[PDB]
PDB file of all heavy atoms in Angstrom:
ATOM      1  N   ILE A 169     -24.502 -28.702  -3.718  1.00  8.01           N
ATOM      2  CA  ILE A 169     -23.832 -27.517  -3.199  1.00  8.01           C
ATOM      3  C   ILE A 169     -23.131 -26.777  -4.328  1.00  8.01           C
ATOM      4  O   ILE A 169     -23.145 -25.544  -4.383  1.00  8.01           O
ATOM      5  CB  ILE A 169     -22.847 -27.899  -2.078  1.00  8.01           C
ATOM      6  CG1 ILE A 169     -23.569 -28.634  -0.945  1.00  8.01           C
ATOM      7  CG2 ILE A 169     -22.153 -26.661  -1.546  1.00  8.01           C
ATOM      8  CD1 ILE A 169     -24.331 -27.726  -0.012  1.00  8.01           C
ATOM      9  N   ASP A 170     -22.515 -27.516  -5.251  1.00  8.54           N
ATOM     10  CA  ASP A 170     -21.825 -26.888  -6.370  1.00  8.54           C
ATOM     11  C   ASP A 170     -22.808 -26.221  -7.322  1.00  8.54           C
ATOM     12  O   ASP A 170     -22.532 -25.138  -7.848  1.00  8.54           O
ATOM     13  CB  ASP A 170     -20.983 -27.925  -7.109  1.00  8.54           C
ATOM     14  CG  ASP A 170     -19.829 -27.306  -7.867  1.00  8.54           C
ATOM     15  OD1 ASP A 170     -19.785 -26.063  -7.976  1.00  8.54           O
ATOM     16  OD2 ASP A 170     -18.963 -28.062  -8.354  1.00  8.54           O
ATOM     17  N   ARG A 171     -23.956 -26.856  -7.566  1.00  7.04           N
ATOM     18  CA  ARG A 171     -24.972 -26.218  -8.400  1.00  7.04           C
ATOM     19  C   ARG A 171     -25.409 -24.889  -7.794  1.00  7.04           C
ATOM     20  O   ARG A 171     -25.470 -23.859  -8.483  1.00  7.04           O
ATOM     21  CB  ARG A 171     -26.172 -27.149  -8.568  1.00  7.04           C
ATOM     22  CG  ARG A 171     -25.958 -28.268  -9.569  1.00  7.04           C
ATOM     23  CD  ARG A 171     -27.278 -28.772 -10.122  1.00  7.04           C
ATOM     24  NE  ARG A 171     -27.113 -30.000 -10.893  1.00  7.04           N
ATOM     25  CZ  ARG A 171     -27.408 -31.218 -10.455  1.00  7.04           C
ATOM     26  NH1 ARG A 171     -27.886 -31.424  -9.239  1.00  7.04           N
ATOM     27  NH2 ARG A 171     -27.215 -32.259 -11.260  1.00  7.04           N
ATOM     28  N   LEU A 172     -25.703 -24.893  -6.492  1.00  4.23           N
ATOM     29  CA  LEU A 172     -26.110 -23.660  -5.825  1.00  4.23           C
ATOM     30  C   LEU A 172     -24.994 -22.625  -5.861  1.00  4.23           C
ATOM     31  O   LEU A 172     -25.249 -21.431  -6.059  1.00  4.23           O
ATOM     32  CB  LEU A 172     -26.516 -23.953  -4.381  1.00  4.23           C
ATOM     33  CG  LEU A 172     -27.884 -24.594  -4.144  1.00  4.23           C
ATOM     34  CD1 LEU A 172     -28.198 -24.602  -2.661  1.00  4.23           C
ATOM     35  CD2 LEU A 172     -28.980 -23.876  -4.910  1.00  4.23           C
ATOM     36  N   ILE A 173     -23.751 -23.062  -5.657  1.00  5.09           N
ATOM     37  CA  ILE A 173     -22.622 -22.139  -5.666  1.00  5.09           C
ATOM     38  C   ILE A 173     -22.508 -21.467  -7.025  1.00  5.09           C
ATOM     39  O   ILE A 173     -22.326 -20.250  -7.120  1.00  5.09           O
ATOM     40  CB  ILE A 173     -21.324 -22.879  -5.297  1.00  5.09           C
ATOM     41  CG1 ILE A 173     -21.271 -23.136  -3.792  1.00  5.09           C
ATOM     42  CG2 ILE A 173     -20.109 -22.080  -5.739  1.00  5.09           C
ATOM     43  CD1 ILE A 173     -20.277 -24.200  -3.395  1.00  5.09           C
ATOM     44  N   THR A 174     -22.607 -22.252  -8.098  1.00  6.66           N
ATOM     45  CA  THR A 174     -22.514 -21.682  -9.436  1.00  6.66           C
ATOM     46  C   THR A 174     -23.631 -20.675  -9.675  1.00  6.66           C
ATOM     47  O   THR A 174     -23.389 -19.562 -10.162  1.00  6.66           O
ATOM     48  CB  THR A 174     -22.560 -22.794 -10.483  1.00  6.66           C
ATOM     49  OG1 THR A 174     -21.452 -23.680 -10.291  1.00  6.66           O
ATOM     50  CG2 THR A 174     -22.500 -22.211 -11.885  1.00  6.66           C
ATOM     51  N   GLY A 175     -24.864 -21.043  -9.324  1.00  5.01           N
ATOM     52  CA  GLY A 175     -25.974 -20.130  -9.549  1.00  5.01           C
ATOM     53  C   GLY A 175     -25.810 -18.821  -8.798  1.00  5.01           C
ATOM     54  O   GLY A 175     -25.979 -17.734  -9.361  1.00  5.01           O
ATOM     55  N   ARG A 176     -25.460 -18.907  -7.514  1.00  8.23           N
ATOM     56  CA  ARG A 176     -25.352 -17.701  -6.704  1.00  8.23           C
ATOM     57  C   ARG A 176     -24.142 -16.864  -7.100  1.00  8.23           C
ATOM     58  O   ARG A 176     -24.201 -15.631  -7.045  1.00  8.23           O
ATOM     59  CB  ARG A 176     -25.301 -18.079  -5.227  1.00  8.23           C
ATOM     60  CG  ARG A 176     -26.612 -18.659  -4.731  1.00  8.23           C
ATOM     61  CD  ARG A 176     -26.486 -19.313  -3.373  1.00  8.23           C
ATOM     62  NE  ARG A 176     -27.779 -19.787  -2.896  1.00  8.23           N
ATOM     63  CZ  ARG A 176     -27.987 -20.337  -1.709  1.00  8.23           C
ATOM     64  NH1 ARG A 176     -27.003 -20.503  -0.841  1.00  8.23           N
ATOM     65  NH2 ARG A 176     -29.214 -20.731  -1.384  1.00  8.23           N
ATOM     66  N   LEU A 177     -23.047 -17.504  -7.513  1.00  6.89           N
ATOM     67  CA  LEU A 177     -21.905 -16.754  -8.018  1.00  6.89           C
ATOM     68  C   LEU A 177     -22.273 -15.993  -9.282  1.00  6.89           C
ATOM     69  O   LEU A 177     -21.885 -14.832  -9.453  1.00  6.89           O
ATOM     70  CB  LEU A 177     -20.738 -17.705  -8.280  1.00  6.89           C
ATOM     71  CG  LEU A 177     -19.362 -17.078  -8.504  1.00  6.89           C
ATOM     72  CD1 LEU A 177     -18.947 -16.223  -7.321  1.00  6.89           C
ATOM     73  CD2 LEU A 177     -18.334 -18.163  -8.763  1.00  6.89           C
ATOM     74  N   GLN A 178     -23.031 -16.628 -10.179  1.00  2.00           N
ATOM     75  CA  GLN A 178     -23.482 -15.926 -11.376  1.00  2.00           C
ATOM     76  C   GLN A 178     -24.373 -14.746 -11.012  1.00  2.00           C
ATOM     77  O   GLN A 178     -24.255 -13.661 -11.598  1.00  2.00           O
ATOM     78  CB  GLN A 178     -24.223 -16.891 -12.298  1.00  2.00           C
ATOM     79  CG  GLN A 178     -23.963 -16.658 -13.772  1.00  2.00           C
ATOM     80  CD  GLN A 178     -24.827 -17.532 -14.656  1.00  2.00           C
ATOM     81  OE1 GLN A 178     -25.050 -18.706 -14.361  1.00  2.00           O
ATOM     82  NE2 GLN A 178     -25.322 -16.962 -15.748  1.00  2.00           N
ATOM     83  N   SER A 179     -25.274 -14.939 -10.046  1.00  2.00           N
ATOM     84  CA  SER A 179     -26.145 -13.845  -9.625  1.00  2.00           C
ATOM     85  C   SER A 179     -25.331 -12.678  -9.077  1.00  2.00           C
ATOM     86  O   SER A 179     -25.583 -11.513  -9.412  1.00  2.00           O
ATOM     87  CB  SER A 179     -27.139 -14.343  -8.577  1.00  2.00           C
ATOM     88  OG  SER A 179     -27.893 -15.435  -9.070  1.00  2.00           O
ATOM     89  N   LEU A 180     -24.344 -12.975  -8.228  1.00  2.67           N
ATOM     90  CA  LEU A 180     -23.508 -11.916  -7.674  1.00  2.67           C
ATOM     91  C   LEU A 180     -22.729 -11.198  -8.765  1.00  2.67           C
ATOM     92  O   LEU A 180     -22.594  -9.970  -8.733  1.00  2.67           O
ATOM     93  CB  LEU A 180     -22.548 -12.485  -6.630  1.00  2.67           C
ATOM     94  CG  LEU A 180     -22.869 -12.217  -5.159  1.00  2.67           C
ATOM     95  CD1 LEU A 180     -21.779 -12.798  -4.281  1.00  2.67           C
ATOM     96  CD2 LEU A 180     -23.016 -10.729  -4.889  1.00  2.67           C
ATOM     97  N   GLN A 181     -22.189 -11.945  -9.730  1.00  2.00           N
ATOM     98  CA  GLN A 181     -21.446 -11.306 -10.811  1.00  2.00           C
ATOM     99  C   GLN A 181     -22.341 -10.369 -11.608  1.00  2.00           C
ATOM    100  O   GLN A 181     -21.943  -9.244 -11.936  1.00  2.00           O
ATOM    101  CB  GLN A 181     -20.831 -12.365 -11.723  1.00  2.00           C
ATOM    102  CG  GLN A 181     -19.423 -12.768 -11.328  1.00  2.00           C
ATOM    103  CD  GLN A 181     -18.916 -13.957 -12.116  1.00  2.00           C
ATOM    104  OE1 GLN A 181     -19.455 -14.293 -13.170  1.00  2.00           O
ATOM    105  NE2 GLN A 181     -17.871 -14.600 -11.610  1.00  2.00           N
ATOM    106  N   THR A 182     -23.560 -10.812 -11.924  1.00  2.00           N
ATOM    107  CA  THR A 182     -24.485  -9.952 -12.654  1.00  2.00           C
ATOM    108  C   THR A 182     -24.789  -8.688 -11.861  1.00  2.00           C
ATOM    109  O   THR A 182     -24.759  -7.573 -12.400  1.00  2.00           O
ATOM    110  CB  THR A 182     -25.774 -10.713 -12.960  1.00  2.00           C
ATOM    111  OG1 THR A 182     -25.482 -11.838 -13.797  1.00  2.00           O
ATOM    112  CG2 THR A 182     -26.777  -9.810 -13.659  1.00  2.00           C
ATOM    113  N   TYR A 183     -25.078  -8.845 -10.568  1.00  4.91           N
ATOM    114  CA  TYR A 183     -25.402  -7.687  -9.745  1.00  4.91           C
ATOM    115  C   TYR A 183     -24.236  -6.711  -9.689  1.00  4.91           C
ATOM    116  O   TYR A 183     -24.430  -5.495  -9.788  1.00  4.91           O
ATOM    117  CB  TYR A 183     -25.789  -8.137  -8.338  1.00  4.91           C
ATOM    118  CG  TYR A 183     -25.779  -7.026  -7.318  1.00  4.91           C
ATOM    119  CD1 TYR A 183     -26.837  -6.136  -7.224  1.00  4.91           C
ATOM    120  CD2 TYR A 183     -24.712  -6.867  -6.447  1.00  4.91           C
ATOM    121  CE1 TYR A 183     -26.832  -5.120  -6.294  1.00  4.91           C
ATOM    122  CE2 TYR A 183     -24.699  -5.854  -5.514  1.00  4.91           C
ATOM    123  CZ  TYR A 183     -25.761  -4.983  -5.442  1.00  4.91           C
ATOM    124  OH  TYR A 183     -25.753  -3.971  -4.512  1.00  4.91           O
ATOM    125  N   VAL A 184     -23.015  -7.224  -9.538  1.00  5.13           N
ATOM    126  CA  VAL A 184     -21.858  -6.345  -9.411  1.00  5.13           C
ATOM    127  C   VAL A 184     -21.583  -5.624 -10.723  1.00  5.13           C
ATOM    128  O   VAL A 184     -21.212  -4.447 -10.727  1.00  5.13           O
ATOM    129  CB  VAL A 184     -20.633  -7.141  -8.931  1.00  5.13           C
ATOM    130  CG1 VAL A 184     -19.366  -6.326  -9.118  1.00  5.13           C
ATOM    131  CG2 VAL A 184     -20.804  -7.529  -7.474  1.00  5.13           C
ATOM    132  N   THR A 185     -21.745  -6.310 -11.857  1.00  4.35           N
ATOM    133  CA  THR A 185     -21.553  -5.636 -13.139  1.00  4.35           C
ATOM    134  C   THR A 185     -22.577  -4.523 -13.332  1.00  4.35           C
ATOM    135  O   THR A 185     -22.233  -3.410 -13.762  1.00  4.35           O
ATOM    136  CB  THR A 185     -21.636  -6.646 -14.281  1.00  4.35           C
ATOM    137  OG1 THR A 185     -20.659  -7.674 -14.084  1.00  4.35           O
ATOM    138  CG2 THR A 185     -21.384  -5.966 -15.614  1.00  4.35           C
TER     139      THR A 185
END
Side-chain angles (χ1 to χ4, degrees):
Chain A
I169 302 281
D170 204 350
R171 282 204 190 102
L172 283 189
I173 284 162
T174 299
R176 292 167 177 184
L177 194 58
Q178 218 186 320
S179 303
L180 255 183
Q181 268 172 18
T182 298
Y183 164 80
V184 166
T185 303

